[PDB]
Amino acid sequence: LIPAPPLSKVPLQQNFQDNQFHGKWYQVGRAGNAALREDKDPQKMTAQIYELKEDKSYNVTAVRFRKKKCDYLTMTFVPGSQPGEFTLGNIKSYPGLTSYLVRVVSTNYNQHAMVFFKKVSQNREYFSITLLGRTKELASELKENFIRFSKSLGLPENHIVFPVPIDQCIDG
């Protein structure tokens, strides 16, 4: 594990528009401070649906292709006073999770987004950054910008992964 960065190093998308951020996003890139993992099984891409609710929170559902079937997980992001920042609803329901924070760093809403996550699980602090795309593939310039932002946070190139687009489940 590499140290979580001070929030002052993590920008917040100016004038965040929650109703433009809703809908389907693909995780085209991700970088975390965690385990690094050896595996001759390539990482498959996942999709996330940000469902904006009446209480202004998002029910975020991710889906992955696993054991020949589709596997879903939904988490509720509760808005803070600063637009684009969130905390986790019903944290007691997640075994081991004691702190959780979300910050939308940047997005143009119709193509891409970069989201920062910081959490404490079983007394260890983890953080990650994801590159979301409206499509499964994004321009090399957006991926390089994501790579340099991840680096700016102290993450080495080998912690950065661009999951392989697949057809199963995520075209949901």
Ligand X SMILES: O=C(O)CN(CC(=O)O)[C@H](Cc1ccc(NC(=S)NC(CO)(CO)CO)cc1)CN(CC(=O)O)[C@H]1CCCC[C@@H]1N(CC(=O)O)CC(=O)O
The residues of the shown chain that bind ligand X, judged by CB under 6 A, are: 27, 30, 46, 48, 60, 62, 64, 71, 73, 75, 115, 117, 128, 130
Are 157 and 149 a contacting pair, CB within 8 Å?
A: no
Q: Identify residue 111 by its one-letter amino acid code.
A: Q
Token digits of residue 10: 């993590």
Any long-range contacts for 12-15 (C-beta under 8 Å, 24+ apart)? 12/82, 12/84, 12/85, 12/103, 12/104, 12/105, 13/84, 13/104, 13/105, 13/106, 13/107, 15/83
| Residue at token pair 């970069």 | 114
Q: Cβ of residue 124: shortest distance to ligand X, in angstroms?
A: 14
Q: Cβ of residue 113: shortest distance to ligand X, in angstroms?
A: 10
Q: Pick between residue 109 and residue 117 the one whose CB is nearest to ligand X.
A: 117
Q: Pick between residue 60 and residue 120 the one whose CB is nearest to ligand X.
A: 60
Q: Pick between residue 3 and residue 35 the one whose CB is nearest to ligand X.
A: 35
Q: Cβ of residue 75: shortest distance to ligand X, in angstroms?
A: 4
Q: Cβ of residue 30: shortest distance to ligand X, in angstroms?
A: 5
Q: Cβ of residue 36: shortest distance to ligand X, in angstroms?
A: 13
Any long-range contacts for 73-78 (C-beta under 8 Å, 24+ apart)? 77/102
Q: Pick between residue 75 and residue 155 the one whose CB is nearest to ligand X.
A: 75
Q: Pick between residue 64 and residue 103 the one whose CB is nearest to ligand X.
A: 64
Are 47 and 25 a contacting pair, CB within 8 Å?
A: yes
